[PDB]
Amino acid sequence: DLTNADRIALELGHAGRNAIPYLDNADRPFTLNTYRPYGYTPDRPVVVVQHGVLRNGADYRDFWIPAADRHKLLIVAPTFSDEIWPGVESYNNGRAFTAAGNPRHVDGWTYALVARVLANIRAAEIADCEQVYLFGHSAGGQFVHRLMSSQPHAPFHAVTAANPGWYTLPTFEHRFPEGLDGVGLTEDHLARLLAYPMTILAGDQDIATPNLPSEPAALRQGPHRYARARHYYEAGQRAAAQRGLPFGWQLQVVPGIGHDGQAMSQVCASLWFDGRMPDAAELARLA
Ligand SMILES: [Cl-]
Ligand SMILES: [Cl-]
């Protein structure tokens, strides 16, 4: 008799950290590692945080605590374990393919779970989800931009993909995940992707050259994540211009920060909620 909304109402009603088992993808549970600050009220923002390759959602949720306490944000980190969601295929790439290599419908992709969880937070009356912010670092920045390529944008007020290891390029020339072909996506998905004011957040010290995506499609985008971020940005610029479409993306370089999900989390919080880049002294503190 309990629904996911009922569960969320009971688990997210009080302040503090939590790890909420969630089952939507009938056979694949995951966890919401959450933080609710004292003084959270339902009108305040919800930040969805996506972990990188380590699948350390609890850690990512912890990185956002100081910003949540200052700004009264509800932090939700959908967490996909290596055991239940193995490999880049299940997490980074959204389980886009069946085992036979045929496309699954986009509402079955791992990405589509974000909006469902949000609808449940709203049905639980925990948050009205008017202003939802979506952040992902590394594998989770791969997840976020591919979510934006494949899913409705209505639930999301702001979206930042930080230091993705490599990118799905905005073109039907290559099969997903290298491009948008072979997965039932349309030119409308592409137009909506291009229009959205997504931030690509790139540390200019993310320039080390083992966990770095090293398949040929990743290598073609550049020697390191910082180069790849610039490559993605220009690819979107060209895709929009060849189509005469509006282009909403912003490339935001972070000076002196490398591949550091905690630093990139605090920079993102600063940009979104303080309206500013931290100063050099702060950035040096974070580095
Ligand atoms: Cl549901
Ligand atoms: Cl290839």
Ligand nearest, relative to CA of residue 218? 2
For the chain, give every domain's residue range: 1-287
Task: Say which residue the tokens 């980190």 belong to.
Answer: 77
In this structure, the strands spanning 46-50 and 132-137 are: parallel
| Most distant CA atoms of the chain, gap in Å | 54
* Cα–Cα distance for residue pair 34/15, rounded to 1 Å: 10
Cis, bond preceding 177 (omega within 30 deg of 0)? yes
CA of 89 to the centre of ligand 1 (A): 24
- Reference 184, options 102, 115, 113; nearest CA is 102
CA of 75 to the centre of ligand 1 (A): 20
- What resolution in angstroms, rounded to 1 decimal? 1.8
In this structure, the strands spanning 74-79 and 16-22 are: unpaired
Q: Are 142 and 164 in contact, with CB atoms under 8 Å apart?
A: yes
3-state SS, 245-260, equals CCCCCEEEEECCCCCC
Hey, what amino acid is at 21? P
The strands making up 158-162's β-sheet, listed across from edge to edge, are 16-22, 30-36, 74-79, 46-50, 132-137, 158-162, 199-203, 250-254
CA of 202 to the centre of ligand 2 (A): 25
- Backbone phi, psi, residue 222, to 5°: 140, 170
3-state SS class at 106:
helix
CA of 101 to the centre of ligand 1 (A): 27
Would you give the distance in Å from CA 151 to the centre of its chain? 12
* Cα–Cα distance for residue pair 46/85, rounded to 1 Å: 24
| Cβ count within 10 A of residue 233 | 17
CATH of domain 1-287: 3.40.50.1820
* Cα–Cα distance for residue pair 34/229, rounded to 1 Å: 29
* Cα–Cα distance for residue pair 15/93, rounded to 1 Å: 33
* DSSP conformational letter for 95: T
CA of 219 to the centre of ligand 2 (A): 10
- Reference 138, options 78, 234, 226, 220; nearest CA is 226
* DSSP conformational letter for 36: E
Q: Are 200 and 232 in contact, with CB atoms under 8 Å apart?
A: yes
3-state SS class at 117:
helix
Q: Are 241 and 178 in contact, with CB atoms under 8 Å apart?
A: no
In this structure, the strands spanning 132-137 and 158-162 are: parallel
Ligand nearest, relative to CA of residue 174? 2
